Structure 1
Amino acid sequence: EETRKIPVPANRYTPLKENWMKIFTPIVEHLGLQIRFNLKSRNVEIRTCKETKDVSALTKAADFVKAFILGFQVEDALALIRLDDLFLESFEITDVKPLKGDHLSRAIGRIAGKGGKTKFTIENVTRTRIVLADVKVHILGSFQNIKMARTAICNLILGNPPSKVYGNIRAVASR
């Protein structure tokens, strides 16, 4: 038997309650794995059974629920199950420049943009999914798309305006 434990934070319990159906139904139907949610230790527990094939699905299944722990939407992690080369890379905003106080919140606002649209635009440029924590940034996609999204984000918080990075990333996506 193979054991995977995925931790859940305190703020992720309610979206896990509201999205549990679309979490166990993809696993229990076509991945052939047993899943439960240990409330006593607060862990999503995944183990194999007698009806599992292609054991790497287990690994992807863990990454599946890991994405929903990190804040990603459900169907993106469904695409993580369906596709074969999808990865997530995370870094804090202060991991590339020392920002304090109101500067850090301004960096958060520059990543998100007004209405979220700037972040949304970068997604539609790079075919990736970007989730902002309080200070951490998580990018889900393939390797080169992760690199383009990470370069766009690192330019956005360097001080470059969202319009300039917007135009540059919308032009450089034709390669």
Structure 2
Amino acid sequence: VSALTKAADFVKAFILGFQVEDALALIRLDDLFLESFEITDVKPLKGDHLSRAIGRIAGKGGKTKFTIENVTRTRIVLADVKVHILGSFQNIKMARTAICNLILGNPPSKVYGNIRAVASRSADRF
């Protein structure tokens, strides 16, 4: 009965820009979700300031994106001013907090320290 619903989510993830292997988790597991929001949602930002916000999330060579990428066990796609997050419910909350802090102007090094603490303290992390 749930076959058709799972397939529709799978193709939608690919359209958003996720990898095919990446989106394949929507079929194999039953508890993965997608979350989206705009950069202007967290802070009203314009012009060159908006461009610097995008750079702070990505980092040099995408390393800042990859740093949060592994530790939260999530896939995130940054499409212009739209941010898409793929993961489980608890893991989406962790990634969404970290990305919001970067937009508000915190340096990436400060963000790195916090996410290490949050992941380590959580005993049960599915």
Same-fold call, TM > 0.5? yes
Q: 1: distance between equivalents of 2:3 and 2:119? A: 31
Q: 1: distance between equivalents of 2:3 and 2:77? A: 24
Higher helix share goes to which structure? 2
C-alpha root-mean-square deviation of aligned residues, in Å?
A: 0.8
Instruction: Please give the per-residue CA displacement for 1:144-175, whole angstroms capped at 9, x wherever unaligned.
Output: 10000000000011100111101211221113
Runs in 1 of length 4+ with deviation above 6 angstroms? none
Normalized against structure 1, the TM-score is what?
Answer: 0.68
Equivalent residue number for residue 66 of structure 1: 12
Equivalent residue number for residue 84 of structure 1: 30
Instruction: Please give the per-residue CA displacement for 1:79-120, whole angstroms capped at 9, x wherever unaligned.
Output: 111111000000010011000000111000011111101111
Q: 1: distance between equivalents of 2:108 and 2:75? A: 18
Q: 1: distance between equivalents of 2:110 and 2:97? A: 13
Q: 1: distance between equivalents of 2:63 and 2:3? A: 34
Q: 1: distance between equivalents of 2:101 and 2:6? A: 31
Tell me how far 1:57 sits from its aligned partner: 1.9
Q: 2: distance between equivalents of 1:125 and 1:147? A: 13
Q: 2: distance between equivalents of 1:104 and 1:60? A: 36
Q: For CA contacts below 8 A with separation 6 or more, give which structure has more relative contact order.
A: 2
Identity, % of aligned pairs? 100
Q: 2: distance between equivalents of 1:72 and 1:172? A: 26
Higher strand share goes to which structure? 1
Number of equivalent positions? 121
Equivalent residue number for residue 158 of structure 1: 104
Tell me how far 1:56 sits from its aligned partner: 1.0
Normalized against structure 2, the TM-score is what?
Answer: 0.93
Counterparts of 1:1-175 in structure 2 under 5 Å?
55-175=1-121
Unaligned runs of 5+ in 1: 1-54
Q: 2: distance between equivalents of 1:94 and 1:100? A: 8
Unaligned runs of 5+ in 2: 122-126
Secondary structure of the residue aligned to 1:173 is helix
